[PDB]
Amino acid sequence: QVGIPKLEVDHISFSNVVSMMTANIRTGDDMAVERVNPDDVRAINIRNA
Amino acid sequence: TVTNEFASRFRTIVATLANVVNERAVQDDMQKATRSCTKQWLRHLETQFD
Amino acid sequence: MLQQPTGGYTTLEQFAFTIRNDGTNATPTQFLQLLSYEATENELVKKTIPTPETHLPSARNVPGNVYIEDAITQALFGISAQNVNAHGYFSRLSALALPNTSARLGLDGVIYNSETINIPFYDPAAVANFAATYAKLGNASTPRYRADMIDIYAHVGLELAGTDAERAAGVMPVKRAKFDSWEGSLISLSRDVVNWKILAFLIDLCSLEGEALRAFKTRNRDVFRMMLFIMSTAVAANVVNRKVTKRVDRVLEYIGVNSMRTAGRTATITYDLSRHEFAAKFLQLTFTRWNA
Amino acid sequence: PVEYGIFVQRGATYTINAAGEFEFSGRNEKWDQALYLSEHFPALFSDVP
Amino acid sequence: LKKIAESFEDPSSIVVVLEFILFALFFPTEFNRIKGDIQNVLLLFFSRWY
Amino acid sequence: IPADELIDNLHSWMRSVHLLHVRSEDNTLRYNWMLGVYARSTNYTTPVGQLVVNAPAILNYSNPQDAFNSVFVALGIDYID
Numbered sequence A: 001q002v003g004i005p006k007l008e009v010d011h012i013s014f015s016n017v018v019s020m021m022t023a024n025i026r027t028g029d030d031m032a033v034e035r036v037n038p039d040d041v042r043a044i045n046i047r048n049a
Numbered sequence B: 001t002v003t004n005e006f007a008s009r010f011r012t013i014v015a016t017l018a019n020v021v022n023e024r025a026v027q028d029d030m031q032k033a034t035r036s037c038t039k040q041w042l043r044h045l046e047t048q049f050d
Numbered sequence C: 001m002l003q004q005p006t007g008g009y010t011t012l013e014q015f016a017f018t019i020r021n022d023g024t025n026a027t028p029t030q031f032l033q034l035l036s037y038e039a040t041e042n043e044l045v046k047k048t049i050p051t052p053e054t055h056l057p058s059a060r061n062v063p064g065n066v067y068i069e070d071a072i073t074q075a076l077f078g079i080s081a082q083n084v085n086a087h088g089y090f091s092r093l094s095a096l097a098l099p100n101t102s103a104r105l106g107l108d109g110v111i112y113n114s115e116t117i118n119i120p121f122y123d124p125a126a127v128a129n130f131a132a133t134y135a136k137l138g139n140a141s142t143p144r145y146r147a148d149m150i151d152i153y154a155h156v157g158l159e160l161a162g163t164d165a166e167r168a169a170g171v172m173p174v175k176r177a178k179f180d181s182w183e184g185s186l187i188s189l190s191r192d193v194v195n196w197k198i199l200a201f202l203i204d205l206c207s208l209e210g211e212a213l214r215a216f217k218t219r220n221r222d223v224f225r226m227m228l229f230i231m232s233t234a235v236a237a238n239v240v241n242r243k244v245t246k247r248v249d250r251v252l253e254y255i256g257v258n259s260m261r262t263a264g265r266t267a268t269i270t271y272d273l274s275r276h277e278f279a280a281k282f283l284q285l286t287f288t289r290w291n292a
Numbered sequence D: 001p002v003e004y005g006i007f008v009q010r011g012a013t014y015t016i017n018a019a020g021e022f023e024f025s026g027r028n029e030k031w032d033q034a035l036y037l038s039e040h041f042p043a044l045f046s047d048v049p
Numbered sequence E: 001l002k003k004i005a006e007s008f009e010d011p012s013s014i015v016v017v018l019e020f021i022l023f024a025l026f027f028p029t030e031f032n033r034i035k036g037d038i039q040n041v042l043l044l045f046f047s048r049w050y
Numbered sequence F: 001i002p003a004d005e006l007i008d009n010l011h012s013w014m015r016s017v018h019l020l021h022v023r024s025e026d027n028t029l030r031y032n033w034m035l036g037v038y039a040r041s042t043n044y045t046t047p048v049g050q051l052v053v054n055a056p057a058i059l060n061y062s063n064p065q066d067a068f069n070s071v072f073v074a075l076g077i078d079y080i081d
């Protein structure tokens, strides 16, 4: 049998398995990048599909 | 005693690249200029390598 | 290694597929009895499903043990899955495709690069038969191998809504599914299904042959149909509720018609374009195996 | 402007093939002195009506 | 490879190609390691020039 | 419109157009008239246009589908309007 979902029934449960991220995963940090500007503005292609 | 196979190989490479640049169609006049100068710079690279 | 029985791995109680329903662990078949249909004027005609590409995408050199079952189920059934082809780990099934590979597919649904202690796993031959087809999920997004995501849904409808006569005919009216429902029914159905150990189902579907495969196809038709139901709700153009004298009838219109919707909704899981490409590929492969 | 448009639609340059005919570039473009040692000619000076 | 953004419009862009060739001559091994990443640049060069 | 004037004008105009192309010995080729005309109409400013300019030979094709595939792959574009 599969277990009954805790949210399906009206009983309260005080031991639960909360997933969480370790120090290795990080989110919402700012991220460094090397931007490289076009060599000549006149050579830029605005158009093609 | 005289020929250096490395340098000769770079000669054929630069010759190829030069005829590659020469054959390159260009629109702007300035590109036509850089096309002609790049070949000279190539020639210079060849002597520096040799 | 768990040896595969004369029947499928699905004969083992360890891989029961059940949806929670009316306070019990209902078998999917007895949920589908709740389903009812309202034909519309429109018609589904099933076309031949194109033969899947011979090309198994190369497994990339991946150091880790990919959790394949989780990826597949979340792609087909997950409430929050997105960009399922960007990570591109389905190609990993191809690692199991080789004869005498060191890789094992654990009952966990993980793809170990090497057999490892105290981790039970499916018999490598059966897994090889499985991967030899399902690795092609690994090219669900590559343009040359993308499945049709429109026509294939007809088969879904036929295998779901279709009466035996309509299935023999190969055509059925576009139907509209309905069942008496509790709050958040389709979400809960989808989560009860995402928890399924469907690798057992697919492995048995690919490995079995002759009488065993046929007995499997009948014993497990309603499991397949449940997966088809979750998937179809993911592509149903709309999913309304109807009052019916102090009861509420959930109604999804329509079965067998992919509306290609990608906007999210509370009622059911949603396919992003990538999830569509994946489901389309999955249905191509799985329907191919289902008919032989 | 109109004579110019016709002229430049014939092209800013030309080459002379082995037959001795002038094949015009058919393409508007500025001249550079690089082209002076090329097979190309400024078209204004073709004297071709 | 330390990535190079290069459209290859100007003939002078041949410099980058040469930069690779020299690297492939002076350092065949290290080149052989970074060479697919080099192919990503070269493919731009070819799609534009050839 | 008097016929002599419509004729003299249409003639001068037609003589004015000069599609970019490479001539070739092979009997299997067709010039890709659509793409070459389109590159002309935009004075070869569009990426397909400057493609046609640096490689006029890309308009020649033996297989009709590759006439466009070669351009789509050279350009990285998914389509052309």
Ligand SMILES: Nc1nc2c(ncn2[C@@H]2O[C@H](COP(=O)(O)OP(=O)(O)OP(=O)(O)O)[C@@H](O)[C@H]2O)c(=O)[nH]1
Pocket: F033, F034, F035, F037
């Ligand atoms: N600019 C341009 N448009 C083209 C060219 N060739 C085809 N088309 C357009 O492509 C479109 C698609 O083809 P169809 O409309 O089916 O063909 P059609 O020209 O109307 O001829 P029929 O259908 O036989 O009557 C047409 O609207 C054409 O105008 C071309 O070389 N240059």
